[PDB]
Amino acid sequence: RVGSAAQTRAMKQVAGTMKLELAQYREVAAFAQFGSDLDAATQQLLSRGVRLTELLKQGQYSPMAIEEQVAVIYAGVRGYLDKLEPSKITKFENAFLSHVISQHQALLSKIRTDGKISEESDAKLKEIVTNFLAGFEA
Amino acid sequence: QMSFTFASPTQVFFNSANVRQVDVPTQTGAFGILAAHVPTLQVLRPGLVVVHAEDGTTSKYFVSSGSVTVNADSSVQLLAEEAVTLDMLDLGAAKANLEKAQSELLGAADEATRAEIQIRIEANEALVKAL
Amino acid sequence: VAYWRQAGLSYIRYSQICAKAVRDALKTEFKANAMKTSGSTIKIVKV
Amino acid sequence: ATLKDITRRLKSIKNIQKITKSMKMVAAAKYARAERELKPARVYGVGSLALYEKADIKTPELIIGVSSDRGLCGAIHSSVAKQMKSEAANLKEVKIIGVGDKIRSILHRTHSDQFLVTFKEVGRRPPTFGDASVIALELLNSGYEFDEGSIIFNRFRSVISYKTEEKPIFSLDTISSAESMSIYDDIDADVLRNYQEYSLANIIYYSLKESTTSE
């Protein structure tokens, strides 16, 4: 009931479209397993659907910092994992997040501080994920 | 008055229409079926179809192949695997096509292969005629 | 006899070639329908 | 009546309803397109048949069944199969062909040792003259010098009705050499060879175009 009155602007910046593609997937999900010939419109939402879902997965005893959560959510929400294999998103995130927690603590510190995803940090993330992904499927 | 039916798998041009005459390209020349012609059966050849309507200025069409039939009754039926009005044919292409064909033939020894090329040549060649 | 016959070819096969030629000699504005026809889906099951 | 079971059933029926409503709309789209392309096809196919009814053909002295690969279309397949077994029985040598995997699975076992060929990839994409030519070719290139054959398919009538019908295949170039054919002269013994081959593809095409509309 409290809703966004309690989310950070950073999160909202991402949470919002995720909430929406998921609700949309939920409408079509059941079709998947018998989708002998669905149009690419809905076939799209099934794909966003399963990736976004894989991003919500989580191991125990390892709670994340709001900045790490938006960086990862941004990745699928923006479409970067759409061509990735569902079976790999768990592995991707893990390593992707290991990478930015290692190498990029200045961007996360930004996201953190600025409280949102500046147009800049936005661009920096684009490159960070498009180069990491390339690395990733080598 | 003859009931003329002319169509392809996909499009139909005439259905039991009272035409005064039709000119069709056959394996043996170009027979001209008249409102009253003796019964016959013939296989088509890449060429042209001419339909002399009830009112002068005839309509033209292009046919790739198929069949034509004239029965005891004044009923005729022309069936082309593909039949199009010249209105939709690019002459420029045909030329480019007759060239290639005559080239492949020069590089083919296989009797069957040659046949497939020869036939293609004939068709594309026939394209020059009304274009 | 025709050249295609004796060479092993039949008439449907001739018509096939002839019909395709007329297609390739069209112009994009009518070239679209070419696809909505001349399929090849059918598959042989010989045993 | 357990709130558990009841819930289990609701779960699976809500999905069925969803997948089933989807399949309906897809079909109605395929149907709409099929109903239209069928207009010309009939005239064309009826034209191909315009020679034989307009003038007798019998036979002195091959069952082709057409449908598809996909089920969930009421009795499309069972109908042709039903009539297919009927013929093979009442009959003269017996040899058969089935276009659409379903026929090869239905009027099958009992008659495998009574097969010539079978076809797959039928129904998903709209049928073409091209597919009909493959069927015809595949037959002409077969060692079955059939004297007479029949083609069994479903003739469309309306969204809520169709009728399994049969069409004679006097393709016997030999049979097309009877008395009734004396009316048409100036016919090389081998011009017919081309004529028959062609009219064979036309009839397979027609049945094919009627079939998907019914399906």
Phi, psi of D81 (to 5 degrees): -55, -50
For strands B32-34 and D63-66, give the pairing. unpaired
Same domain, B59 and B26: yes
- Check if D137 contacts C (Cβ < 8 Å): yes
Residue D136 contacts C, CB cutoff 8 Å: yes
Within this chain, do residues B75 and B118 fall inside the same structural domain, yes or no?
no
B17 touches chain D (CB under 8 A): no
In this structure, the answer to whether residues B40 and B74 fall within a common structural domain is yes
Query: Cβ of B89 and C27 within 8 Å?
Result: yes
Q: Please tell me whether residues B101 and B37 are part of one structural domain.
A: no
Residue D164, helix vs strand vs coil: strand
C-alpha span between A113 and A67 (Å, rounded): 9
Nearest of C42, C45, C39, C46 to residue C16 by alpha carbon: C39
Q: What is d(CA D74, CA D98) in angstroms, rounded to the nearest whole number?
A: 19
**Separation CA B44–CA B6 (nearest Å):** 13
3-state DSSP assignment of residue D156: strand
Q: Which residue of D has its CA nearest to A37?
A: D26
Q: What is the CATH number of the domain that holds B70?
A: 2.60.15.10
What technique was this entry resolved by?
Answer: X-ray
Assign residue D172 the CATH number of its domain: 3.40.1380.10
What are the structure tokens assigned to B77, written together?
């039926």
The reply to whether B34 and B63 lie within a common domain is yes
Give binding residues of A as ranges: 58, 60
Q: Residue type for C39, please?
A: G
Are A31 and D124 a contacting pair at CB < 8 A?
no
Min Cα distance D195 → chain B (Å) is 6
C2 near B CB under 8 A? yes
- Residue C19: name the closest of B126, B42, D58 by CA: B126
Rounded CA separation A84/A75 (Å): 11
**Integer angstrom CA distances of residue C27 from B63, B120, C24:** 16, 18, 8
Neighbours of D155 (CB within 10 A): 18
Q: What is the CATH number of the domain that holds B118?
A: 1.20.5.440
B62: left (phi over 0), alpha (psi -120 to 50) or beta: beta
**Pick from B126, B83, B127, D133: which is nearest to C30 by CA?**
B83
Question: For A64, which DSSP code?
Answer: P
Domain of residue D120: give its range: 26-215
DSSP string of A107-136? HHHHHHHTSS--HHHHHHHHHHHHHHHHHH
Contacts of D8 (CB under 8 A, 6+ apart): none
Does B28 reach chain C within 8 Å, measured CB to CB? no
Start-to-end CA distance of chain C, whole Å, equals 33
User: Helix (H, G, I), strand (E, B), or coil: what is residue D158?
Assistant: strand
Cα pseudo-dihedral D94, C42, D68, D215, rounded to 10: -120
Residue contact D26–A30, C-beta within 8 A:
no
Q: Provide the CA D151 distance to its chain's centre, in angstroms.
A: 6
Q: Which of B65, B112, B127 sits opposite C25 (nearest CB)?
A: B127
Residues 5-44 (D) with a CB less than 8 A from some CB of A: 14-15, 18-19, 22, 26
Contact D120 C40 (CB under 8 A): no
Which residue range forms the structural domain that includes residue B99? 90-126
A127 CB neighbour count, 10 Å cutoff: 9
Q: Which two tokens stand for residue D132?
A: 């009909």
Mark whether A1 is an active-site residue.
Answer: yes
Q: Domains in chain A, please, with CATH?
A: 8-138 (1.20.150.20)
Can you tell me the distance from the alpha carbon of B14 to that of D37, in angstroms, rounded to the nearest whole number?
A: 16
Cross-chain residue pair D128–C43, CB shorter than 8 Å: no
Amino acid (1-letter code) at residue D21: K
The type of residue at D144 is Y
Assign residue D165 a region: left if phi > 0, alpha if psi is -120 to 50, beta otherwise?
beta
Pairwise CB contact (< 8 Å): D22 & A31: yes
Structure tokens given for D99: 């276009």
Q: Within this chain, do residues B77 and B104 fall inside the same structural domain, yes or no?
A: no
Name the residue among B44, B46, B91, B130 with its Cα closest to residue C26: B91
Q: Does residue B71 sit within a domain?
A: yes
Catalytic residue among A1, A26, A51, A78: A1
Give chain B positions within 8 Å (CB) of C8: 111-112, 115
Candidates D18, D26, D124; nearest CB to A30? D18
Q: Cα–Cα distance between B62 and B128 in angstroms, integer?
A: 11
For chain A, what is the largest distance between any 2 Cα atoms, rounded to a whole number of angstroms? Answer: 48
B20 and B56: one domain?
yes
Shared domain check, B69 and B17: yes
Tell me, rounded to whole angstroms, the distance of Cα D68 from its chain centroid: 9
Q: Would you tell me how many other CB atoms lie within 10 Å of the CB of residue B86? A: 14
Q: Resolution for this model in angstroms, one decimal place?
A: 5.0
Number of structural domains in chain B = 2
Q: Give Cβ neighbours of residue D130 (< 8 Å, ≥ 6 apart).
A: C16, C37, C38, C39, C40, C42
Sign of the alpha-carbon torsion through A39, A40, A44, A46: positive
Q: How buried is residue D189: exposed, middle or buried, by Cβ count under 10 Å (0-12/13-18/19+)?
A: exposed
- Chain C, nearest residue to D133 by Cα: C12
Q: How many Cα neighbours within 13 Å face the side chain of D185?
A: 3
Chain B CB contacts of C11 under 8 Å are 43
Please report the DSSP string for B48-111 in residue order.
Answer: EEEEE-TTSS-EEEEE-SEEEEE-SSSEEEEEESSEE-GGG--HHHHHHHHHHHHHHHTT---H
Q: What are phi and psi of D100, to 5 degrees?
A: 110, 115
Crossing angle of helices A9-28/A40-55, nearest 10°? 130
Contact A129, A75 (CB under 8 A): yes
Chain C contact for B120, CB < 8 A? yes
The tokens 């010939």 sit on which residue? Answer: A37
Instruction: Determine, yes or no, domain membership for B80.
Output: yes
Q: H or E segment at B21? A: strand B21-23
Which chain C positions have a beta carbon within 8 Å of D122's beta carbon?
41-42
Q: What burial letters (b/e) apply to D51-90, b meaning 16+ CB within 10 Å?
A: bbeebebeeeebbbbbbbbbeebeebbebbbebbbeebee
User: A50 φ, ψ to 5°?
Assistant: -70, -30
Q: CB distance from D144 to chain B under 8 Å?
A: no
Q: Which of residues 143-202 of D touch A (CB under 8 A)?
A: none
- Strand segments, DSSP code E, in D31-116 are 63-66, 96-99
Contact C37 D104 (CB under 8 A): no
* Integer Cα distance of B39 and B33 in angstroms: 10
Mark yes or no for CB contact D26/A34 under 8 Å: no
Judging contacts by C-beta atoms under 8 Å, the chain D residues touching residue B73 are 54
